[PDB]
Design a protein around this ligand. Structure first.
Ligand SMILES: *[C@@H]1O[C@H](CO)[C@@H](O[C@@H]2O[C@H](CO)[C@@H](O[C@H]3O[C@H](CO[C@@H]4O[C@H](CO)[C@@H](O[C@@H]5O[C@H](CO)[C@@H](O)[C@H](O)[C@@H]5O)[C@H](O)[C@@H]4O)[C@@H](O)[C@H](O[C@H]4O[C@H](CO)[C@@H](O)[C@H](O)[C@@H]4O)[C@@H]3O)[C@H](O)[C@H]2NC(C)=O)[C@H](O)[C@H]1NC(C)=O
Length: 361
């Protein structure tokens, strides 16, 4: 099985114990580690952070201890303008300059491949995405004639039916990609005025109006569109989403006024790291959506949807039962990476739980 784990460059700036450098990563935990995110300047791949050159180097020394570990560099992301990707991909001269700049950059800094995180192509972009993937893969194939191990190409793909239909020719891009990570953890957010879970495994016979907003539907739909099971990797989150309750109601369908309050270390409205949730749970009431098979917790006017060891092991069993290529984790720096917040002296408890399931029959 593959275990694909993202590390995010901005996690280095978090204070005290929340600070996470590539250094903290156990080299034997994941099969592939992806560094997020690279920039595009002058139509060429480039660094984002001031000290990226150093961090690349720290990440790639993990390979001195585990020579089988693979590392990828992810380009794009949320803070990258979708329109900036659109402009690059739709003009042949810009697209060509970009593609040619990638292999030398990856080689200089020690990466084994490139992850595309264009979030998200519009209906006008779908054709250009296909072209970008095709031509990117062709160039990696050509570069490997120089006797080096061929660069890997992956893509992060949204799990909502409408985003898929609008932006992605799954049947075509599947043939050129080494793996596709399905982002099965954005099924709810502050954008609706109610409480709900962003990563449910199943629909659960109760659910109103969205048979499609669950991991099971997204996986079955990708399989139907022509993504081969052995290229499909199911995304499992290591963070939670928080909401401020608008009333004293805390069950399904409850009102909300907005995001939850920022966490001590992540400092971002609406999300919490798992190591912050471990702390939040002291004094919280815990519940579990039995149909959806995911927990949530509530304390005061704060309502948190999250994943724990049981829910993550369940998702891992599901994906094995479906014979998928593996699991993808967003993100190593949001799991309890020091191992000192969540009880047990177990570093990476969520990621480890996934690995345990994937390593059994
Ligand atoms: C990821 O990469 C991206 C892509 O490169 C990085 O984003 C860019 O990087 C640089 C530097 O930070 C900037 O590049 C040049 O910017 C200037 C361009 O000028 C413009 O400013 C005006 C604001 O008034 C703005 O508005 C319009 O244009 C005209 C203005 O007359 C106006 O009539 C219109 O109505 C518009 O309002 C316009 O959009 C431009 O942004 C240059 O001045 C910069 O410095 C050089 O400039 C001169 C030569 O051109 C020299 O005199 C100077 O000495 C110097 O050499 C610079 O070259 C970009 O702004 C920026 N672009 C994008 C796409 O965002 C990004 O930083 C990176 N991310 C990270 C984390 O690194």
């Amino acid at each position: 099985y593959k275990l694909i784990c993202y590390y995010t460059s901005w996690s280095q700036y978090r204070e005290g114990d929340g600070s996470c450098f590539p250094d903290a990563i156990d080299p034997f935990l994941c099969t592939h580690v992806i560094y997020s995110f690279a920039n595009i300047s002058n139509n060429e791949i480039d660094t984002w952070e001031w000290n990226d050159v150093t961090l690349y180097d720290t990440l790639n020394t993990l390979k001195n201890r585990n020579p089988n570990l693979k590392t990828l560099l992810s380009v794009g992301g949320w803070n990258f303008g979708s329109e900036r990707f659109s402009k690059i991909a739709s003009k042949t001269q810009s697209r060509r300059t970009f593609i040619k700049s990638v292999p030398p950059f990856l080689r200089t800094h020690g990466f084994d491949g490139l992850d595309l995180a264009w979030l998200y192509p519009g209906w006008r972009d779908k054709r250009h995405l296909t072209t970008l993937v095709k031509e990117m893969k062709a160039e990696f194939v050509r570069e490997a004639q120089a006797g080096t191990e061929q660069l890997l190409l992956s893509a992060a793909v949204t799990a909502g039916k409408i985003a898929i239909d609008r932006g992605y020719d799954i049947a075509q891009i599947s043939r050129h990609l080494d793996f596709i990570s399905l982002l099965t953890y954005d099924f709810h957010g502050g954008w609706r005025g109610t409480v709900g879970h962003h990563s449910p495994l199943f629909r659960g016979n109760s659910d109103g109006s969205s048979r499609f907003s669950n991991a099971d539907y997204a996986v079955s739909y990708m399989l139907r569109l022509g993504a081969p099971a052995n290229k499909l990797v199911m995304g499992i989150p290591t963070f939670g989403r928080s909401y401020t309750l608008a009333s004293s109601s805390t069950r399904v369908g409850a009102p909300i006024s907005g995001p939850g309050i920022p966490g001590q270390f992540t400092k971002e409205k609406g999300i919490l790291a798992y190591y912050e949730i471990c702390d939040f749970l002291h004094g919280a009431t815990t519940h579990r959506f039995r149909d959806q098979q995911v927990p949530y917790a509530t304390k005061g006017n704060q309502w948190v949807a999250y994943d724990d060891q049981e829910s993550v092991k369940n998702k891992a069993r599901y994906l094995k039962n479906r014979q998928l290529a593996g699991a993808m984790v967003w993100a190593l720096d949001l799991d309890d990476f020091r191992g000192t917040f969540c009880g047990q002296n177990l570093t990476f408890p969520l990621t480890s739980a996934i690995k345990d399931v994937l390593a059994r029959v």
